[PDB]
């Protein structure tokens, strides 16, 4: 089940890095040096944020009991 | 039915990422944002609970 | 059919939440706790939503 | 196909309920539907259906504009 | 025995996809042609006009989208290496 | 399998549409926009490819970190 629900955060993560790193002007058809970097950083920060959530949340799945 | 918690888990992560991570300079979360996402989790969680309760308090009326 | 009827009112439930999340909880998250305000709003938003839902059903079913 | 007609019903339905509650309902200070909202939505529900109609009528000048030619490759034979 | 159809039938996913695309397009023409006020219930003339044009334009843009798409597929032959020099280092 | 791609596809169609097409005075895809579309199509694929990469570079970086464990003892 780690697949059907991984390929998900992927589409989510993609849709997201897109919004935050790609402006709707589409003046030029190839990635901007900067745009290229922004994506990278985003992709990473996205993954980071993704884990500590699974962690912090799991914590509160035990503690509560 | 465990495919509910996981989708909702992603639905969540995405969100918190969206509202909490603004301006990308390095590939490691800034403290300011660090807390932001942490809270975004609690807030959002409580929320789904309340809504959930207020939802149950509906079927009672008809039943 | 029953298998459906229920699952639908599960899609609704998610749409609804997505809604009231927007309408009531701002993207600031100052404190992880529900502000008295944000909590009240959230009660009505659910309420108001469910209404438009039962009413949307009738006016619609009445259309078929 | 009649359940694949009750899968699209319920679906669309939810899709609508939402679209209206979102454009219309915007005053949170009452568990009651402010009438200025009770009307917006009621038109939304109509404006919608009447729209979802006009669309279709058009997407059908896509699948029909080509059959007047395949009803032609039908003429060289029988008739 | 069995039918060799199963194979060529699935090829009909074009249908379960035109649906998906159908919705999309609908939701996009809505967001483009029908403002959220819903002043009145009937379709404003233009609204109907605008819907007419949107529904058209969307189709077109979707066809071209497809066209280009398949192009860049039968052309990954590192022929795209000749394309990466021609477009004027964009 | 193949659905995932068409699914993406259809989502691209949309996204490029709303960001590219804007003037609705005619029925023909205005030329200035028929372009945005194309760049949007390209720019996009180019984006997914990149993101994809860094994603692997994340697993093969999360794979080597298991190896470390496998050496302390």
From Swiss-Prot, chain A:
Its main location: mitochondrion. GO terms for cellular component: mitochondrial inner membrane; mitochondrial intermembrane space; mitochondrial intermembrane space protein transporter complex; mitochondrion; TIM22 mitochondrial import inner membrane insertion complex; TIM23 mitochondrial import inner membrane translocase complex. Ubiquitous, with highest expression in heart, kidney, liver and skeletal muscle. One of its GO terms (biological process) is sensory perception of sound. Keywords: Chaperone, Disulfide bond, Membrane, Metal-binding, Mitochondrion, Mitochondrion inner membrane, Protein transport, Translocation, Transport, Zinc. A motif (Twin CX3C motif) lies at residues 17-42. It is a peripheral membrane protein. GO terms for molecular function: membrane insertase activity; protein homodimerization activity; protein-folding chaperone binding; zinc ion binding. Coiled coil: none annotated. Disulfide bonds join 17-42, 21-38. It is found in: Mitochondrion inner membrane. Belongs to the small Tim family. Heterohexamer; composed of 3 copies of TIMM9 and 3 copies of TIMM10/TIM10A, named soluble 70 kDa complex. The complex forms a 6-bladed alpha-propeller structure and associates with the TIMM22 component of the TIM22 complex. Interacts with multi-pass transmembrane proteins in transit. Also forms a complex composed of TIMM9, TIMM10/TIM10A and FXC1/TIM10B. The twin CX3C motif contains 4 conserved Cys residues that form 2 disulfide bonds in the mitochondrial intermembrane space. However, during the transit of TIMM10 from cytoplasm into mitochondrion, the Cys residues probably coordinate zinc, thereby preventing folding and allowing its transfer across mitochondrial outer membrane. Mitochondrial intermembrane chaperone that participates in the import and insertion of multi-pass transmembrane proteins into the mitochondrial inner membrane. May also be required for the transfer of beta-barrel precursors from the TOM complex to the sorting and assembly machinery (SAM complex) of the outer membrane. Acts as a chaperone-like protein that protects the hydrophobic precursors from aggregation and guide them through the mitochondrial intermembrane space. This is Mitochondrial import inner membrane translocase subunit Tim10. It comes from Homo sapiens. The gene is TIMM10. The chain holds residues 13 to 77 of 90 of the full protein.
UniProtKB/Swiss-Prot annotation, chain F:
Ubiquitous, with highest expression in heart, kidney, liver and skeletal muscle. It is a peripheral membrane protein. Keywords: Acetylation, Chaperone, Disulfide bond, Membrane, Metal-binding, Mitochondrion, Mitochondrion inner membrane, Protein transport, Translocation, Transport, Zinc. Its main location: mitochondrion. One of its GO terms (molecular function) is protein homodimerization activity. It comes from the Eukaryota. Coiled coil: none annotated. Disulfide bonds join 16-40, 20-36. GO terms for biological process: protein insertion into mitochondrial inner membrane; protein targeting to mitochondrion; sensory perception of sound. The twin CX3C motif contains 4 conserved Cys residues that form 2 disulfide bonds in the mitochondrial intermembrane space. However, during the transit of TIMM9 from cytoplasm into mitochondrion, the Cys residues probably coordinate zinc, thereby preventing folding and allowing its transfer across mitochondrial outer membrane. Belongs to the small Tim family. Heterohexamer; composed of 3 copies of TIMM9 and 3 copies of TIMM10/TIM10A, named soluble 70 kDa complex. The complex forms a 6-bladed alpha-propeller structure and associates with the TIMM22 component of the TIM22 complex. Interacts with multi-pass transmembrane proteins in transit. Also forms a complex composed of TIMM9, TIMM10/TIM10A and FXC1/TIM10B. This is Mitochondrial import inner membrane translocase subunit Tim9. The lineage of its organism: Eukaryota, Metazoa, Chordata, Craniata, Vertebrata. The chain holds residues 13 to 85 of 89 of the full protein.
């Amino acid at each position: 089940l780690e697949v059907e629900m991984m390929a998900d955060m992927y589409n989510r993560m993609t849709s997201a890095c897109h919004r935050k790193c790609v402006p709707p002007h589409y003046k030029e058809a190839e990635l901007s040096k900067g745009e290229s970097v922004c994506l990278d950083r985003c992709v990473s920060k996205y993954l980071d944020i993704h884990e500590r959530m699974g962690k912090k949340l799991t914590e509160l799945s035990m503690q509560d009991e | 039915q465990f495919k509910e918690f996981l989708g909702t888990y992603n639905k969540l992560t995405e969100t918190c990422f969206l509202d909490c991570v603004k301006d990308f300079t390095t590939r490691e979360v800034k403290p300011e944002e660090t807390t932001c996402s942490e809270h975004c989790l609690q807030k959002y969680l409580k929320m789904t609970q309340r809504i959930s309760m207020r939802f149950q308090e509906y079927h009672i009326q008809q039943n």
